[PDB]
Design a protein around this ligand. Structure first.
Ligand code: CFM
Ligand code: CLF
Ligand code: SF4
Ligand SMILES: [Ca+2]
Ligand SMILES: [Ca+2]
Lengths: 477, 522, 145, 522
């Protein structure tokens, strides 16, 4: 597909929209140019969504409770507000963890204040207090409590910060109030931030004067990995086999304690830049700790990262870094040998949140796959910068794409495989185009690391070359 | 590591020694986790009667609810109408979960939109998000009708759906005769089922309120059928089938049975079949209106009896031998069509089955939960089978209901040890199954955990979960099942007896130990 | 209607040749025939297929698994006069009864019914030197009349 | 002991300490059993590759067959005819097992009689047992027709069913026009499916042989359908349903779908519906005759093509997406009726499902077994799903079949590791599942054991059995299932994927160990 051709498409598509919308949308669609280094010159992002267009975006809450906090295993997260939000997100994100559920770990659990006609009327600041006591009594081993506020809290002046301070002090227990009310911001992003800040203000600096923790010149912390299907663990193992010592994981199978010792580290390894760069930049000021972003999607990008990381230490590390790559070379290569053929030349289209849309490209190319179009559901301009460099030439880029939009593009471009969310998975399948949840690994994974890729491949395969696809068209049609 | 020949995924990958020794360090090293022996202590504690008492005293805390908010049902309901696009006036994040939720349960595309209201509207409402919204939607997905619901926000800051809609028409954002029914659906009131009630009602009005003059009860010789919040396709169908087999003219109000099962032929349909608008407009002319799931259609029965002037019967959700009879009968009475040999037989067979395998079901303690009608129908049926529904929980139920159920329980020897609970959640149920242990749980996937827990305490304590309800995510295509009518009875009866036998096999498969009761013929 | 004959006799005396020519002449007359080599030497078909040495069951079977791992397609060949011929297979030096390799070759033919086929004749070229139970096979199973 | 309040049956009664210490003495004291350690030795041995080799070399011994004798099928077949009484001319003991067998599978009353031949007839046949027999039967259960089959004895001493029957008419024991078809069914030839073939054929003749003059192919605009030996009610139905939905005129020859599901209304029916005699008589006038399960209807295809002069098509048992298409098509071609949107959709849906859950089914090794058509259709379908049918066993199959299957396997990437076996039994399969382990077995209840064994070796070795086939006794009402057509595909697809997921849950339910992969959404 030519450049002058793609441009035309976008236009032919926007012809449906009404004036006002047709304009804002035109700004969120572009034809990649690997040359440009400033996104602002072709694609605008992180702006309010147009009403009625069926976006795939979400809200602060999700970006907060479901994205950052919910993952911590030892604390208890309270979905403060009506029952709604709390229920849908329950165990909806496969951010794995190790622990005895209900006793000292609570992730696949739903804690909510369940607001009622009266809690909205007279505020439920009261209930929230009582609640905590009941909490503290029935799940003693909890090492902390959070309060992810849903849409109604901020709208009725309730004041959680107080209750927290009070009850927290009163019980010698940590309690984090989070103003993640859905109406704030326009995506899951503002939630991240709001969340990050919260993390800092009420938890981060809790062990600054405390120096009993024995450190080492090889301590690090993985920031930005949510152990989706075990991603973290697959990444973790490499870093350690590399000799390093990761003190924490944010927030994949992470614990409050692991978070607290984060300042006692030498290097911050950030995966999801968009989700936690906020706490990193901070950690750099209030702790002088350096932070670099890596990527473990596909042998190539992985190897490249492993070294670029070892390069921040001594020989002992950089030697091991090679010992590792060595060990796994036979494996990842053997994989490419089996699947690379079965995929070579197949074009793919993606649309995810704020990192994967680009991070996974490498892995795909490593399998002769061609990403003809990717885009973000809520990424910021700085994300598209890092992006345009990975995406090929004359490719298609879309921000906060609309249901209609995404659907039409696919129809013209006719990708060989679409990787996106669940609110899509089923649409394109009826059109007969293989699909893979790039969000939840389609209940598979992990995809990060070496032992990961193996699967990533195997999967892309099974789904793309599955016979079922050759049967859509009826014989008598 | 990985053997390109036999790749291992998340599981059992992490069972590999290295991963084992990997996580072990991470634990001891930075997790500062409570000594196992404590975790084992605390756990054991929660499985006690003492913990229960403390648990049931909860007032402000709710752990693992068993209900969703109103909009979720308003959406579903709206989906039952030809080219109708569910529109939720409020924050966009909500619609996200809605589609996302249903998709996992139906494994089908759920079409629904939002006028993405934000912070900048928490002061001056969204009289604009509505204007632009309705226009954008109508011109993009070109629906024939747009039903409007609301989210938490929308109601708290209080927006007048009616007004806003009337202005979006006045100011010319959407034609003035373009159907745009509406209903307020506060999250903080009742459960999702309530949404449906409202929504439906909201549509009923929009097509029959301002025009009851030329309407005359019985003029069409049809019976209106309102399914309520139903998530099992097979139901909508069996209803239609039974009636059509009876020669009865019917008008199913709110039929999503088509858009929830669009076929995979190469093209995506965002709409499919469903209750036509004309069907709604005419409804008033129907001989009468039957409510399949009454216990959560009061706001509709009111309107129906009040406006349309229909004599809605006092019928229970048609589940199990008994009630379904009553349903067929009342239907006859109204329509004037005799119960066809066909059904007389289906019934007979349902009975055959019952006798064919009571021996196994007899005296089997169950703990169950779900929605009002569903739950009570399940209870009723278990009694018709000779089981003891010991823990009938129902988070979204009310007192009036609890009574009706107790009445049903009291009318059967098999209801002596039955207890009904409302307002309680799955964390409560968790205890009821430890202290006063049943043999199985009949409920949704959220119950998969309760099982895990019962096992952690021990094999002899594990309580197998029998998925029947909503939502269901850890199994596929069960949404094609059927619970209503005799067809339904049969399915459930089988899903049961077999679940039982299924487990008895597992308990007697032990070689030279218990495999002596591993009979071939059962 | 199908006669089952077997030619027995000492080795190194043109037996196999006479047999094959017999079948050949038998073919001209119009009789559809089938030869089954039971001579450990394995050379009872060469003269019909022109081949230097046909593939014995026992060979191709050990290049497939057990027995019914292969198909008559590469075991039974049609040479001059449409004759069908298969060579049993020499017993494994030291280990294995020649007779054994025979039955397995017959029973195989029986299974894929290489018999029910308008055959008027079927000759089992059998080496009758040390007339043991092994070489007696085709007679014991009562496949040779 | 027993607590009148909570009575324990066989299990777990004998787990009580006293019963434990009770049996313990009995063992040590008089059983002279091999020291455990040996039993453990021998066992382990059987699970080896070495044992397999030795096992597959069996010639005279058969352990745990997977077929039944002919008569069993002649009976079933005969049951598909209006007021027809299956009559087995031979020892009475046989009929005992027959009814007794089917009852366990259908949980319905199987009506069948025997002319109780004894020792005193092993010399002079039973020319009398026939005379009195036919008379007694006819006057007692007053059937409209009596189909005669034979048992092992009858054939060995060799009795001429035809003659005996002709004399029973001549001597005046039963009217001369009373329909009494017959067929010889030697236990020692083929399996039970062969009986059906025979029997059916035997009836076909009795009504069309002596009168092919006034018959003219295509004169009735109908298609005859011969179901063969079918034990899943749901099938007979789906066929009728699909055709009737297609506007095709059909004549199902041998329909027991009614007497195998008589309703429980207070009165016992020994007969119910079934192929009328006139239907058979007229069959010749049918446009053509389709064989649902060809692989075991050769003796009928012959007669059909040979006498009725029909051009029977080369169709495979309609199972799975592909073949069922071909079936519908060929049916169209013949009838001249287009494939209705209805089915075009049902199909599309079947596909949706497939795509909806291939991920889970893909690359799943199965070991299966049953009858020819059934097995091959199962195989075909598993391939359309992306599974690897590794151990296709079929005791009653033949070489010609094995080839057709291998042809089917060879035409698919998913058939690389596939191996077909005929003549082998369940004890062989037992080894195949230990050495080259699959993930599930798809077969009848006889396989429940193989599972036990796979477990005795270890949890990681256990292979879950998935009941689909015949006979089935450890579960209830599965005989109402459906395997043919799209309806069928769906059922199986579900029974599968879910059986899979069902097990994955079990493997990740361990608290703080493997419960991390105990996802809610799958
Ligand atoms: S859509 Fe990651 S910026 Fe966030 S839930 Fe997923 S594309 Fe998220 S990787 Fe993350 S683990 Fe995610 S996949 Fe950054 S945390 S808001 Mo939807
Ligand atoms: S933006 Fe919550 S679902 Fe909504 S109508 Fe809600 S209770 Fe019901 Fe939406 S999800 Fe919740 S209210 Fe939201 S914080 Fe974000
Ligand atoms: S029977 Fe004859 S050929 Fe066979 S093993 Fe004995 S001696 Fe050798
Ligand atoms: Ca679907
Ligand atoms: Ca019965």
């Amino acid at each position: 597909m030519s450049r002058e051709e793609v441009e035309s498409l976008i236009q032919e598509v926007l012809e449906v929209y009404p004036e006002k919308a047709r304009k804002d949308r035109n700004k969120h669609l572009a034809v990649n140019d690997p040359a440009v280094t400033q996104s602002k010159k072709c694609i605008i992002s992180n702006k309010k969504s147009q009403p009625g267009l069926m976006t795939i975006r979400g809200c602060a809450y999700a970006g907060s409770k479901g994205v950052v906090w919910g993952p911590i295993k030892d604390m208890i997260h309270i979905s403060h507000g009506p029952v709604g939000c709390g229920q849908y997100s329950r165990a909806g994100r496969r951010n794995y963890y190790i622990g005895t559920t209900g006793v000292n770990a609570f992730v696949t659990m739903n804690f909510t204040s369940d607001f009622q006609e009266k809690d909205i009327v007279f505020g439920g600041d009261k209930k929230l207090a009582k609640l905590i006591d009941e909490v503290e009594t029935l799940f003693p081993l909890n090492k902390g409590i959070s309060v992810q506020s849903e849409c109604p809290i901020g709208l009725i002046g309730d004041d959680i910060e107080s209750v927290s301070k009070v009850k927290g002090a009163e019980l010698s227990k940590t309690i984090v109030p989070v103003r993640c009310e859905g109406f704030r911001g326009v995506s899951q992003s503002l939630g991240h931030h709001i969340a990050n800040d919260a993390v800092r203000d009420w938890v981060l600096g809790k062990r600054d004067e405390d120096t009993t923790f024995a450190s080492t010149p090889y301590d690090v912390a993985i920031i930005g990995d949510y152990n989706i299907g075990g991603d973290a663990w697959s990444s973790r193992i490499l870093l350690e086999e590399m000799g390093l010592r990761c003190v924490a994981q944010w927030s994949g199978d992470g614990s409050i304690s692991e978070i607290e010792l984060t300042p006692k580290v030498k290097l911050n390894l950030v995966h999801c830049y968009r989700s936690m760069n906020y706490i990193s930049r901070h950690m750099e000021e209030k702790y002088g700790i350096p932070w670099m972003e890596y990527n473990f999607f596909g042998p190539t990008k992985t190897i490249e990262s492993l070294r670029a990381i070892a390069a921040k230490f001594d020989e002992s590390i950089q030697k091991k870094c090679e010992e590792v790559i060595a060990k796994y070379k036979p494996e990842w290569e053997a994989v490419v040998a089996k699947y690379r053929p079965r995929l070579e030349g197949k074009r793919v289209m993606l649309y995810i949140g704020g990192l994967r849309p680009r991070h996974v490209i490498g892995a795909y190319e490593d399998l002769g796959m061609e990403v003809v179009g990717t885009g973000y559901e809520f990424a910021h301009n700085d994300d598209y910068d890092r992006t345009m460099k990975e995406m090929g030439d004359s490719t298609l880029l879309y921000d906060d794409v609309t249901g209609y939009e995404f659907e039409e593009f696919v129809k013209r471009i006719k990708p060989d495989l679409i990787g996106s969310g669940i609110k899509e998975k089923f649409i394109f399948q009826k059109m007969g185009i293989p699909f893979r949840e790039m969000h939840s690994w389609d209940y598979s994974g992990p995809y990060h690391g070496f032992d990961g890729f193996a699967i990533f491949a195997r999967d892309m395969d099974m789904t793309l070359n599955n016979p079922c696809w050759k049967k859509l068209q009826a014989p008598w049609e | 590591s990985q053997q390109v020949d036999k790749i291992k995924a998340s599981y059992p990958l992490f069972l590999d020694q290295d991963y084992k020794d990997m996580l072990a360090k991470k634990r001891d090293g930075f997790e500062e986790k409570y000594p196992q022996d404590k975790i084992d202590e605390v756990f054991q504690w929660t499985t006690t009667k003492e913990y229960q008492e403390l648990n049931f005293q909860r007032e402000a805390l709710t752990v693992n609810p068993a209900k969703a908010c109103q909009p979720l049902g308003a959406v579903l309901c709206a989906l039952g109408f030809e080219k109708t696009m569910p529109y939720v006036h409020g924050s966009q994040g909500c619609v996200a979960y809605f589609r996302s939720y249903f998709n996992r349960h139906f494994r089908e595309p759920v079409s629904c939109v939002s006028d993405s209201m934000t912070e900048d509207a928490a002061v001056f409402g969204g009289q604009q998000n509505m204007k632009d919204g309705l226009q954008n939607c109508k011109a993009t997905y070109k629906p024939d009708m747009i039903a409007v619901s609301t989210t938490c926000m929308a109601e708290v800051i209080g927006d007048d759906l009616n007004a806003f809609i009337n202005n979006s028409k006045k100011e010319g954002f959407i034609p003035d005769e373009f159907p745009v029914p509406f209903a307020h659906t506060p999250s903080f009131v009742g459960s999702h089922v309530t949404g449906w009630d409202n929504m439906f009602e909201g549509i009923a009005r929009y097509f029959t309120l301002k025009s009851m003059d030329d309407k005359v009860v019985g003029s069409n010789k049809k019976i209106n059928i309102v399914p309520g919040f139903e998530t099992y396709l097979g139901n909508f169908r069996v209803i239609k089938r039974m009636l059509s087999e009876m020669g009865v003219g019917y008008s199913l109000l709110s039929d999503p049975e088509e858009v929830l099962d669009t076929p995979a032929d190469g093209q995506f349909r965002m709409y499919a079949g469903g209750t036509t608008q004309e069907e709604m407009k005419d409804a008033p002319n129907a001989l009468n209106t039957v409510l399949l799931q009454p216990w959560h259609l009061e706001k509709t029965k009111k309107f129906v009896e009040g406006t349309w002037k229909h004599e809605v019967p006092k019928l229970n959700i048609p589940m199990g031998l008994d009630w379904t009879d009553e349903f067929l009968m009342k239907v006859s009475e109204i329509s004037g069509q005799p119960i066809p040999a066909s059904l007389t037989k289906e019934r007979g067979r349902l009975v055959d089955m019952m006798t064919d395998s009571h021996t196994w079901l007899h005296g089997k303690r169950f703990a169950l939960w779900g929605d009002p009608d569903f739950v009570m129908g399940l209870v009723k049926f278990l009694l018709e089978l000779g089981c003891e529904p010991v823990h009938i929980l129902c988070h979204n139920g009310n007192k009036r209901w609890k009574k009706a159920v107790d009445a049903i329980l009291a009318a059967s020897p098999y209801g002596k040890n039955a207890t009904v609970y409302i307002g309680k959640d799955l964390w409560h149920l968790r205890s009821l199954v430890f202290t006063d242990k049943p043999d199985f749980m009949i409920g949704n996937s959220y119950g998969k955990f309760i099982q895990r827990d019962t096992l952690h305490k021990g094999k002899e304590f594990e309580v197998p979960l029998i998925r029947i309800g909503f939502p269901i995510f850890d199994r596929h295509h069960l949404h094609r099942s059927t619970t209503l009518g005799y067809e339904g009875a049969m399915q459930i009866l089988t899903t049961l007896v077999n679940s039982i036998l299924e487990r008895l096999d597992e308990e007697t498969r032990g070689m030279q130990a218990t495999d002596y009761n591993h009979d071939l013929v059962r | 209607a199908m006669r089952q004959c077997a030619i027995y006799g000492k080795g190194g005396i043109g037996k196999s040749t006479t047999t094959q020519n017999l079948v050949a002449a038998l073919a001209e007359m119009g009789k559809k025939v089938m030869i089954v080599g039971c001579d450990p030497k394995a050379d009872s078909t060469r003269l019909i297929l022109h081949s230097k040495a046909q593939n014995t069951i026992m060979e191709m079977a050990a290049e497939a698994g057990t027995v019914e791992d292969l198909e008559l397609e590469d075991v039974l060949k049609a040479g001059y006069g449409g004759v069908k011929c298969v060579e049993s297979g020499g017993p494994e030096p030291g280990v294995g009864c020649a007779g054994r390799g025979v039955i397995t070759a017959i029973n195989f033919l029986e299974e894929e019914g290489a018999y029910e086929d308008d055959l008027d004749f079927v000759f089992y070229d059998v080496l009758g030197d040390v007339v043991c139970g092994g070489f007696a096979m085709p007679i014991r199973e009562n496949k040779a009349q």
